[PDB]
Design an enzyme around this catalytic site. Structure first.
Site, PDB file in Angstrom:
ATOM      1  N   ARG A  61      -0.399  -6.584   8.125  1.00  0.00           N
ATOM      2  CA  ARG A  61       1.045  -6.936   8.207  1.00  0.00           C
ATOM      3  C   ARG A  61       1.975  -5.796   8.563  1.00  0.00           C
ATOM      4  NH1 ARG A  61      -0.932  -7.286   2.812  1.00  0.00           N
ATOM      5  NH2 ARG A  61       0.535  -6.694   1.199  1.00  0.00           N
ATOM      6  N   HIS A 187       5.718  -1.133   2.965  1.00  0.00           N
ATOM      7  CA  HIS A 187       5.729  -2.339   2.112  1.00  0.00           C
ATOM      8  C   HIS A 187       6.797  -2.140   1.051  1.00  0.00           C
ATOM      9  CE1 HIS A 187       1.766  -3.616   3.758  1.00  0.00           C
ATOM     10  NE2 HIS A 187       1.588  -2.309   3.852  1.00  0.00           N
TER      11      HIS A 187
END
Lengths: 249, 249
Positions: A61, A187
């Site tokens: 991601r 993140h």
């Protein structure tokens, strides 16, 4: 400020909308997460950002977010380096559980400490955990800078900082001083940990800071690679407040 | 053969349908070239390839091809390194012209040497050529291992091998000797130049060799990193034949 850096976090997924922690499980972006990344690239292009280097985690991601951004910029040729040291927080045994399950197996107060506090480490994932193999059988983790058994099995926010900081100091920081324009695609917890360091934010106050997803976060750094004033969110003020609301509470 | 290497070339574009050389013009893949990349990833997946490192050029069509392939494989964490020395052949003054324009501007017999010969170098692009500024004002060529002014302004296939070889010898070959499984995402001429070197193909024979696009090319190498046997095309033999036909005329 002598130097300027951009950091961001990818759009979050289905588990997040069900208040589950993805952590080290290597979930792909949804189409929403894809639009979010493209939207950053556009905004950064509108600001004529010219990157010399990108740093990502080893979770896809964050790598896809970086790739979609460089594509929106026509900067696909810019080197990308990836590191487990930029990985989301490892939530240990808590990985995969919803709010209710965590609370039942561990107790509501424990769980609040594990999500909320700076220094309290969740219980480690054990081999019996349904996502143990899915993480530690992955070839990714066999070629890190530490052996595969040296890798954490759980992490507090403090523990994040402690494994991220050496990557910052040894790999990213020298590039900044060399005058390069750096993008960090990371993140929620890795980004929060990094800012804590750069802005000398207190152990007490880091807990409460929010970081919207899919927003360029601008850091202006001095001679000593410390923030000159707070981090700045780049782009349209109404998409920024929407995004902040999404990460509230 | 101790070692295996995979190399491929991206799907060709609209200019190649028009018999114009894209060369160092950084054109994106078309929808066809994207699909080919994905299909190749699926083919590499079916064969269970696990890459340790990926080399590309600095032209976005090769980088996008690797990114599509790593996505199909679940291997987005694999390090990518890019280099001008993997770039397509620099066709110099001939960039952007169709065959008819080339022949009108240069003479037809002279045009056929530039296209088909191993070692005749085309005329250099000059600042008057309509594509000069797009190549030479691009930031990407300001951070090469040679200064912007030492960068070629035109090349024969021989010149391509001679600027690819130092990258092979200093960057790639030492990783192959370490036991890493390498993917090279390159271009028609850079793939031809490398295959010529590793297989010991003659200046005469190199010109006629078939290099389909979107097909994994496997080389098996001995301890001196010389091909054991010929390169093999991997996958479905009927798509390989579709692929071969599309490069042939």
């Amino acid at each position: 400020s002598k130097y300027k850096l951009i950091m961001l976090r990818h759009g979050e997924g289905a588990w997040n909308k069900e208040n589950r922690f993805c952590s080290w499980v290597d979930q792909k972006l949804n189409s929403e997460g894809m639009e979010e990344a493209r939207n950053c690239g556009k905004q950064l292009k509108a600001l004529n950002f010219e990157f010399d280097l990108v740093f990502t985690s080893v979770l896809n991601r964050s790598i896809h977010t970086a790739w979609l951004i460089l594509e929106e910029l026509g900067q696909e040729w810019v080197p990308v380096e990836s590191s487990w040291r930029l990985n989301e927080r490892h939530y240990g045994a808590l990985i995969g559980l919803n709010r209710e399950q965590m609370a039942l197996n561990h107790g509501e107060e424990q769980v609040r400490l594990w999500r909320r506090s700076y220094n309290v480490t969740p219980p480690p994932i054990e081999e019996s955990h349904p996502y143990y193999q899915e993480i530690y059988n992955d070839r990714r983790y066999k070629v890190c800078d530490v052996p595969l058994d040296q890798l954490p099995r759980s992490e507090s926010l403090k523990d994040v900082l402690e494994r991220l900081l050496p990557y910052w100091n040894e790999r990213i920081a020298p590039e900044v001083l060399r005058g390069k324009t750096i993008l960090i695609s990371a993140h929620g917890n890795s980004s929060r940990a990094l800012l804590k360091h750069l802005e000398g934010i207190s152990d007490e106050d880091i807990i409460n800071i929010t970081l919207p997803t899919g927003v360029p976060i601008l850091l202006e750094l001095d001679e000593n690679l410390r923030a000159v004033g707070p981090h700045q969110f780049l782009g349209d003020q109404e998409a920024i407040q929407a995004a902040i609301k999404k990460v509230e509470d």
